[PDB]
Structures are given as structure tokens and as C-alpha cells.
Write a protein that binds this ligand. Structure first.
Ligand SMILES: *[C@@H]1O[C@H](CO)[C@@H](O[C@@H]2O[C@H](CO)[C@@H](O[C@@H]3O[C@H](CO[C@H]4O[C@H](CO)[C@@H](O)[C@H](O)[C@@H]4O)[C@@H](O)[C@H](O[C@H]4O[C@H](CO)[C@@H](O)[C@H](O)[C@@H]4O)[C@@H]3O)[C@H](O)[C@H]2NC(C)=O)[C@H](O)[C@H]1NC(C)=O
Ligand SMILES: *[C@@H]1O[C@H](CO)[C@@H](O[C@@H]2O[C@H](CO)[C@@H](O[C@@H]3O[C@H](CO[C@H]4O[C@H](CO)[C@@H](O)[C@H](O)[C@@H]4O)[C@@H](O)[C@H](O[C@H]4O[C@H](CO)[C@@H](O)[C@H](O)[C@@H]4O)[C@@H]3O)[C@H](O)[C@H]2NC(C)=O)[C@H](O)[C@H]1NC(C)=O
Ligand SMILES: *[C@@H]1O[C@H](CO[C@@H]2O[C@@H](C)[C@@H](O)[C@@H](O)[C@@H]2O)[C@@H](O[C@@H]2O[C@H](CO)[C@@H](O)[C@H](O)[C@H]2NC(C)=O)[C@H](O)[C@H]1NC(C)=O
Ligand SMILES: *[C@@H]1O[C@H](CO)[C@@H](O[C@@H]2O[C@H](CO)[C@@H](O)[C@H](O)[C@H]2NC(C)=O)[C@H](O)[C@H]1NC(C)=O
Ligand SMILES: *[C@@H]1O[C@H](CO)[C@@H](O)[C@H](O)[C@H]1NC(C)=O
Ligand SMILES: *[C@@H]1O[C@H](CO)[C@@H](O)[C@H](O)[C@H]1NC(C)=O
Ligand SMILES: *[C@@H]1O[C@H](CO)[C@H](O)[C@H](O)C1(F)F
Ligand SMILES: *[C@@H]1O[C@H](CO)[C@H](O)[C@H](O)C1(F)F
Lengths: 387, 387
């Protein structure tokens, strides 16, 4: 989408994965979907380094809507958002952050909240711009394929017409099977800043693997369509939550990074461990994700040993390599060479291990190297020519 | 098996899951299958509280064998076990531990090492007794159903004839589908102290879940056959390794405990975190697993919320309850009562949370309670009547 926004993948925090549709503030005031939740996350993002590392978006997801007023305008739940959305945007903006919001192209949101139908698209867009929203995620429940075909372009146009730059996240392809000919990716690139290709991420390693598998199986189609202003979205980071081990958390970060994916957290930033914070705030990892070229990486190698190699091209002749173990036994000594991974010859390379910080020097194409990869884990290299 | 052994489930450490068939001691001296690995693990069990908590078995698995000597007598690999097995048994015994060993009823072990064929059963049993081995795991690769049908009873009798009490771990059912009509559990209880029912555990939550699911699907068959001296074996604990999150780790421990499973670790005790040690060395958890009645627990309730309730009966009218979330979203507030869980009425109960140590007192059948269960996690209660 040519709106000047998201020249690199979006970074921030989204409420949905960790906090879902929890509206019981009387019993659970600390974790319910409320202005307090978002204000507290904003505080954390300002104070705990998140903003300084580039995590700038703070995104409301489903279950925020109170209803529609007399003139049909969307309003937040008065009991859970008493100061209103403009106050929340003001608060978020004052902390150097951006506010995202959520709507659904259809009769209702997935959770049954007032939906944005075709006749409400223009009005809701205007409402969001007036509230000074910076991002919108448009879900696609309770609609027909026809209504989506009309509606998603209609919202992209409506947001445009408001004059306010608003990042546009599109669930449309997820509800169509994510593949051509039903899905038209050239059109999605033109109308959206990012799109959810596939199934909702869940707090499990299985969920991560199934998303990876789908992106890899269809990478010939998916890889070329990503770039500055228009990204594939394999969904939220799980790091900080319940279902991923340490190795798996490091794997998701590394793999989302080489896929030029959004880095959208969804976790309790108030209680996140230092170890998980270290994964998410890794400066080299972020720099790689935010590479100005915006070229989505690919799986370039698979072996019977269940070691996979992913590669992403980066600016200044650099590369990201992710050696990924699908094994479930023990650390694996993976032997390879840059030549066997199709790198340019008569150039001496050097690598920095993204997690350990170690530097491997003197790698020619023919040089045999060994990486030790933990089960359901990764080794990640930032690779560059030295001479 | 009526040899006076394993009146409670065995507790200890087994090499296989974490260290597998790594025989490359030249490149990987610290982690290869060698006498040094076993000696170092024995040292850790003696010094770090494991033995004192009841973890007494230190068990060799596959890939220890060097061949057979001129008398047809089994030999360890001379390069990896230069001192021999009697040396290791003596070392282990001097630390108050017991030594387990591994053989295969068939032409070869699963990894291709010399097998204990029918004509070698007596000789190998005698060898193990002479070495002063305390436990034998008899794997079932490279044999026919009829060879196993003769071989397992033959081994039990052969071990008996040595005059040395040797705990007998039988993989027989795992190679027969683990179910009637092919598996006779009344026969197994007579000839074996424990038996591997089902698939090898791998370092993943999916693996834990598939094992749990199979055990629960078949609990009407499996539950009644377990008792003092004859246990079901759902395989090794993964706690300390790579694939399980903290919640999943606590889950496996609690669920193995309610299933009256062996508590056989397979992890690097030299590098184990304080957190994982705290799970495995939980005194109340161990007490429950080691309950003298040896009654295997059951899943007694399942809900569309994906909360499962497991119950194990214990001595002196006590019980263990495991509230288990198969959910993959967020913490779940599970509302229930002891009456809804079919506990005896007009009795006042008290519960201790096994992980937190909190005491919930004065629970009647009618008393509503709430437990907050994390995704892929548990809450575990030790429950008993009070005056
Ligand atoms: C509604 O939709 C319209 C499009 O239909 C949007 O209009 C586009 O707005 C974007 C962002 O403001 C414009 O992109 C910018 O173009 C600047 C100039 O480019 C001119 O020259 C090139 C020749 O190469 C022409 O192709 C082009 O038509 C322009 O005439 C650039 O200077 C900007 O670059 C910025 O980013 C780069 C990063 O690579 C930095 O290095 C620069 O410093 C700079 O910051 C940028 O690329 C685009 O020109 C507009 N398109 C059209 C067709 O008009 C509206 O923004 C949108 N409205 C809303 C509110 O959503
Ligand atoms: C090789 O195989 C043989 C035969 O299977 C084994 O011999 C058995 O050993 C077990 C375990 O020691 C014996 O079981 C115990 O018997 C005690 C008393 O038994 C007497 O009476 C019976 C007949 O009723 C005779 O067989 C026996 O000779 C004795 O005279 C019990 O007191 C024990 O009770 C235990 O369990 C109860 C639970 O009910 C607990 O409350 C107690 O605390 C206690 O721990 C126990 O049942 C069994 O009797 C032996 N059978 C035979 C036929 O002799 C060998 O042990 C085995 N050897 C090796 C090296 O593996
Ligand atoms: C999305 O909703 C439309 C709009 O109708 C709504 O639901 C009706 C049951 C009623 O409560 C209206 O007031 C709502 O506005 C659905 O379109 C209707 O479809 C039915 C046949 O299924 C038809 O009889 C009605 O005439 C349609 N409504 C009008 C007046 O346009 C539509 O079914 C919903 N989309 C899906 C497929 O989920
Ligand atoms: C176990 O080993 C025996 C003895 O070697 C095997 O019997 C041989 O099988 C091979 C290959 O099938 C034949 O070529 C020979 O004719 C057999 N030799 C003898 C001495 O019988 C037997 O197949 C093996 N059993 C299993 C179940 O793997
Ligand atoms: C690297 O190892 C491969 C395979 O083991 C071998 O063919 C080759 O000779 C080695 N190359 C170098 C430069 O040592
Ligand atoms: C538990 O709570 C429910 C609320 O619906 C109530 O019906 C029930 O009587 C309560 N149990 C008691 C006896 O406290
Ligand atoms: C749409 O459905 C839910 C909200 O109910 C959530 O936003 C999810 O990420 C979705 F799939 F986009
Ligand atoms: C048999 O196979 C392997 C050894 O090769 C291991 O012992 C496993 O636990 C088994 F299933 F028992």
C-alpha cells in the first residue's frame, strides 16, 4: 500500500493472542480488555526499552466496541473505556507510540461485536481518523466472499479519503484459503500494508510449525509479493507466553525475522521474563528484520536429518542465515559450507551469531563449518563479506 | 512381577531421551555414551539432592555394547567403557544408587548393537547378575511376535534364577500395539515390574499429548493393571530438556504422577536449571507418585472449555487432583466443586496446591472454588478429609 507507511515490517504489541476477548473487568481488572490494560502496556513500552528498540504500535483487537450511537458512529465500551478512544490515542501519542484499532468486514466481528458492513465502511474510517488512530486491522468474519471483494478495497479507499496516514492490516486472504486464483496478491499489495495469509496463531509450538509449513509450501507464491509498504503476516509473536520453550521462542523470533514478518508481540509486558525480553529486544535481530531492502527470505535447504536452512538477502551485500532443527531428540552437529548454500565464490565471508554474539571469520565458499542446533531451535548468522 | 521390587514406581535417570546413541567421544567427549557420562551423572545424583529425594536408578540404554567375547559373553565398548560394567556398578553402588542396563530381545538392539536372542537370554541374565546390575530394560527390535512371546517370560525366569533381584522393564507391549487381544496385561504383570505400553517419547509437547491421549483413551484397560510391582510406563520425563515450556514441564510431572508412572528423568543433570530441579524434586509430588497403594489415576472429567480433571486415589483417604488445560490461549478460571467431582458428601476437606504450597481449608462438597489454569499447564491439589 502506497501510503508512506511501513517501509519496514511493523513492530509493536497486539492485545489478541494473550488477552483475547476477556471483558470481565469486575473479576479480572488487571487482564480484561480495558483502557487501563492499554495504558499500562504503553507505560511498559516507553520505559522498558520497547519503543527505543522500534516497538511503536500498541494495537487494540476485538471486543472493544460498546455499540453504535444515534448517528451510527462506533463507540467503545463505556464501562471499560470511560475516557474514550481519543484520550487513549492522546496518551499513547504522548509516550512516543502509535495506536492501532480493530474492525470486521461483515455483519459482526468474530466475537459477535458490531461489525463494519459495506454501508458503514466510510463512516468507521472517518471515525478512526478523527480519533487519531494510526493503524487498523480489518477482520473478515460474518461476510460473504462478495462482501469482502467489495469491502476491503472500499476500506482502503475510505482510509485514504480521510487524509490521515493509517496502516492497513487485511485478514481477507485468510478467509479465502490464502492461495490463487481465489486470492489475488498483486491486489492485496496495492490495497494493504500487510495481510494475514493463514490461520490464527495459538500458544503452541504446533501452531508455529503449521504456519511455517504453510509459508514454506507456498513460498514461490508468497515470497515475491512482500516488500516495503506491503508485508505477509504469519501472525503474532508468542514470545513471553506459555506454550513455547526457550529454544522455540528463539526459533520463532529468528524465523519471523527472515520471513520479513511483522514483529507484533502479544504478551503481558508487565511480567515478561528478562530472558524473553532479551530475545525480543536483540538489536541485531531487529536490524535484520527492519532491513531497508525488505526482501522476504526463503527456505533454501532441507535435509533428511530434519535440519532446514533459511536465507534472507540484506542490504550492503549481507545475508541472514537461519539453521533450524525440526528434530526432537538432542543437539545436532550440522556440517555445511557457504558453497553448498549457493553463495558467491572468491569472496571471504564473516558471520556473527545473532544470539551468542560470536564472530566466525575466514569463511570461503569451500570452508567446512559446523553449527550445533538444539531440538526445535535455531542457530542464526548475520553474514557479510570481509575481503 | 513378584520379586519384591518396585512396590512404588521406579525413580531415577535413563540415558536415552537426552543423549541417544551419541558414540562420537572424540568430538563430543562430554555427551557421548561413555562410562564418564554415567559416572558424572551418578556424582550429580549423589551431590545435588536427587538420591535423597528418591531418584535411585541410573540406567544405561542402547549403544553401550562392544560385542561378545570368545565365550559369547556380552561386552561393553572397550573404548567408551574401558573399566567395564562391574566397575560402574560398584561406583554407582558406593554412592547409594542402583545401576540399570539395556538389552534387546531379538537379533540386534534398535540401533544395531548385539542382540539378546533366545539362546542368549540365560547367559545375558547371568552376566547382568554377575555385574551386579539392578535393573534391566529389554527392548523389542529385530524379533518376531513369537520370539518375544517366548523371550520375555524366559528372561524373567532367567533373572530370577540368578538369585539377584533385578527390576524388569519390558518393552514387549509397545511392539504389539499395546492393546488386547495381542497384549495380555495379566501376563505382563506376572513377568514384568513395568512395561512400555506405547511410543517413544520425543522432546516435544505434541509427543507428551499423544502419549497422554493414548493412555486416557485406553484407561479402562490400562488403569486396573497397575499396582505395586507392576507399572504402566508412558516413558521418560522431558523436564530439563529443550521442547517443553515451564507450564508443559509442570504438566508432565503432575500427569505422570497421577498416572503412577515411573519418574525416570533423561536430562543433563550437570546443567539443569534451578527451576526444573524444583519441579522434579518437589517433595509432595514425589510423595504422591510414591503412594504405597499404587493405584493409577484416571481422567474423571473433560469439558468443551478444554479443561480436563485427573484424579488419583491415595492412602489414608487422600486424593490427588490435576486440573489440566489443553487450551492454547490464556489463563482459564475453572469453576467447580468437590461435589461436582463426585467426592464423598458430609465430609470436610483440605487441599494443598502441590506447586505453590498454598492451603485451601474447609472445603465441603457444595463449596464453589476457582482454580486459574495456564494454557498447556496444570493446577494440582493434594486433598484429604479433616475433622
Ligand atoms: C492515498 O493514496 C495515494 C496513492 O494513490 C497516496 O499518495 C502517495 O503517497 C505516498 C506517500 O506520501 C507517495 O510516496 C512518496 O513519494 C515521494 C515523491 O515521489 C515522487 O516521485 C516519484 C518518481 O520516482 C513518483 O513515482 C511519485 O509519483 C512521486 O511524484 C517520495 O519522496 C517519498 O519517499 C519517501 O520515502 C523514502 C523511502 O524510500 C525516503 O527515502 C524519502 O526521504 C521519503 O521520505 C514517497 O515514496 C506517493 O508519491 C503518492 N502516490 C501517488 C500516486 O500520488 C496517499 O498518500 C494516500 N492517502 C492516504 C491519506 O492514505
Ligand atoms: C524368584 O521368584 C520367586 C517366586 O515368584 C520369588 O519368590 C517370591 O518373593 C516374594 C517377594 O519377597 C514373596 O512375596 C512375599 O511373601 C511374604 C510372605 O510369604 C510367605 O508365604 C507365602 C505363601 O503365602 C510363601 O510363598 C513364602 O515362602 C512365605 O512363606 C509376604 O509377607 C510379603 O508381603 C509383602 O507385601 C505385602 C502386600 O500384601 C506388604 O503388606 C508387606 O509389607 C510385604 O512387603 C510378600 O508378598 C513370595 O512369597 C515369593 N514366592 C514364592 C513362591 O516363594 C523370588 O523373590 C524371586 N527371586 C528373585 C531373585 O527375583
Ligand atoms: C449478513 O447479514 C445480512 C443482513 O441481514 C441481517 O440479518 C437478518 C437475519 C436480519 O436480522 C436483518 O435485520 C440483518 O440486517 C444477511 O442478509 C440476509 O439474508 C437472508 C437470507 O439468509 C435474507 O432473507 C435477508 O433478506 C437478508 N437481509 C437483508 C435485508 O439484506 C446475511 O445472511 C448475512 N451474511 C451471512 C451469509 O452470514
Ligand atoms: C534373526 O537372525 C536370524 C539368523 O541369522 C535370521 O535368519 C536368517 O534370515 C536371513 C535373512 O532373512 C536369511 O537369509 C537366512 O536364511 C536366515 N538364517 C538362518 C540361520 O535362519 C532371522 O531372519 C532374523 N530374525 C529377525 C526377526 O530379524
Ligand atoms: C569439507 O568436507 C567435505 C565433506 O566431508 C570434503 O569433501 C571436503 O574435502 C572438505 N573441504 C575442505 C576445504 O576441507
Ligand atoms: C455455587 O455457585 C452457584 C452459582 O450459580 C450456586 O448455584 C450454588 O448454589 C453455589 N454453591 C453453594 C451451595 O455455595
Ligand atoms: C480475527 O478474529 C479474532 C478476533 O475475534 C482475531 O482478531 C484474529 O487475529 C483474527 F483472525 F484476525
Ligand atoms: C528401544 O529403542 C531405543 C534404543 O535404540 C530406546 O531404548 C527406546 O526407549 C526403546 F523404545 F525402548
Amino acid at each position: 500500500l502506497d501510503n508512506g507507511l511501513l517501509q519496514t515490517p511493523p513492530m509493536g504489541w497486539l492485545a489478541w493472542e494473550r488477552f483475547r476477548c476477556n471483558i470481565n473487568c469486575d473479576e479480572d481488572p488487571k487482564n480484561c480488555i480495558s483502557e487501563q490494560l492499554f495504558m499500562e502496556m504503553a507505560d511498559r513500552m516507553a520505559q522498558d526499552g520497547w519503543r527505543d528498540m522500534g516497538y511503536t504500535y500498541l494495537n487494540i483487537d476485538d471486543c472493544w466496541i460498546g455499540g453504535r450511537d444515534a448517528s451510527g458512529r462506533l463507540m467503545p465500551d463505556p464501562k471499560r473505556f470511560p475516557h474514550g478512544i481519543p484520550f487513549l490515542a492522546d496518551y499513547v501519542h504522548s509516550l512516543g507510540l502509535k495506536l492501532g484499532i480493530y474492525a470486521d468486514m461483515g455483519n459482526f466481528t468474530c466475537m459477535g461485536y458490531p461489525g463494519t458492513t459495506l454501508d458503514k465502511v466510510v463512516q468507521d474510517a472517518q471515525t478512526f481518523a478523527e480519533w487519531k488512530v494510526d493503524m487498523l486491522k480489518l477482520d473478515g468474519c460474518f461476510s460473504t466472499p462478495e462482501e469482502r471483494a467489495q469491502g476491503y478495497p472500499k476500506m482502503a479507499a475510505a482510509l485514504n479519503a480521510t487524509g490521515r496516514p493509517i496502516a492497513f492490516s487485511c485478514s481477507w486472504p485468510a478467509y479465502e484459503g490464502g492461495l490463487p486464483p481465489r486470492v489475488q496478491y498483486s491486489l492485496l499489495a496495492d490495497i494493504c500494508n500487510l495481510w494475514r495469509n493463514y490461520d490464527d496463531i495459538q500458544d503452541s509450538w504446533w501452531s508455529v510449525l503449521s504456519i511455517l509449513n504453510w509459508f514454506v509450501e507456498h513460498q514461490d507464491i508468497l515470497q515475491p509479493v512482500a516488500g516495503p509498504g506491503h508485508w505477509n503476516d504469519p501472525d503474532m509473536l508468542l514470545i513471553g507466553n506459555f506454550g513455547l520453550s526457550l529454544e522455540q521462542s528463539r526459533a520463532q523470533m529468528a524465523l519471523w525475522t527472515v520471513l520479513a514478518a511483522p514483529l507484533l508481540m502479544s504478551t503481558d509486558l508487565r511480567t515478561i521474563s528478562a530472558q524473553n525480553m532479551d530475545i525480543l529486544q536483540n538489536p541485531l535481530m531487529i536490524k535484520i528484520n527492519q532491513d531497508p531492502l525488505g526482501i522476504q527470505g526463503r527456505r533454501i535447504h532441507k535435509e533428511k536429518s530434519l535440519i532446514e536452512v533459511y536465507m534472507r538477502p540484506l542490504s550492503n551485500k549481507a545475508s541472514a542465515l537461519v539453521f533450524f532443527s525440526c528434530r526432537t531428540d538432542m543437539p545436532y552437529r550440522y556440517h555445511s559450507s557457504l558453497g553448498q548454500l549457493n553463495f558467491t565464490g572468491s569472496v571471504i565471508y564473516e558471520a556473527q551469531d545473532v544470539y551468542s554474539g560470536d564472530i566466525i571469520s575466514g569463511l570461503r565458499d569451500e570452508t567446512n563449518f559446523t553449527v550445533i542446533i538444539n531440538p526445535s531451535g535455531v542457530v542464526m548468522w548475520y553474514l557479510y563479506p570481509i575481503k
